[PDB]
Amino acid sequence: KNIDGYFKIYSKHTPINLVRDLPQGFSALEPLVDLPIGINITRFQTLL
Amino acid sequence: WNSNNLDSKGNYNYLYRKPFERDI
């Protein structure tokens, strides 16, 4: 997310045993990175 | 502070066009 020119990144990792869908159970994402970049964002694209 | 001894000549290079956003 973007707030006041900060770009904020949160993350989590877990094992999974259903291939089809995201897990029905609950887990929460701790912060990892926070960048003071001051940039307009309206599009994104992943990289493989 | 006034930088009148450093940045004056005149000097025409110094340019003007949400918080902390750089509109380049």
CA–CA dist A22, A17 (Å, integer) = 10
Whether chain A has a CB inside 8 Å of the CB on B19: the answer is: yes
Q: Kindly provide the resolution of this structure in angstroms, with one decimal.
A: 2.9
Q: How far away is chain A from the Cα of B16, in angstroms, using its nearest Cα? A: 18
Whether chain A has a CB inside 8 Å of the CB on B12: the answer is: no
Minimal Cα distance from B24: which residue of A? A39
CA–CA dist A48, B20 (Å, integer) = 32
CA–CA dist B21, B23 (Å, integer) = 6
Give the residue from A9, A31, B14 showing the smallest Cα distance to A1: A9
